[PDB]
Design a binder for this molecule. Structure first.
Ligand code: CL
Length: 89
């Protein structure tokens, strides 16, 4: 249906400060075409273990039962747009 942006972050993760603002850019670009699921790893440890989160930030892009891409590090809004387009075009 629509692309899920599963985003694991923490307040102690330095790169997540900019990652969070980059996610703001992404949402502005896509609107309701993208759904940001912003997850505080410290508040969701079991969910984190489920997706085998070992680094922050971790960004997982999903659409209709299939995972498009996963990044275990900072990714700019522009680069996120690129591989979304790369995987869906
Ligand atoms: Cl949890």
């Amino acid at each position: 249906n629509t692309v899920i942006v599963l985003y694991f972050f923490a307040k102690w993760c330095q790169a997540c400060t900019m990652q969070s603002t980059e996610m703001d850019k992404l949402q502005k670009y896509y609107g309701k075409r993208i759904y940001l699921l912003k997850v505080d790893l410290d508040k969701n440890e079991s969910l984190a273990r489920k997706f085998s989160v070992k680094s922050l930030p971790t960004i997982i892009l999903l659409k209709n039962k299939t995972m498009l891409a996963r990044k275990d590090h900072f990714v700019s809004s522009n680069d996120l747009i690129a591989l979304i387009k790369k995987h869906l075009v």
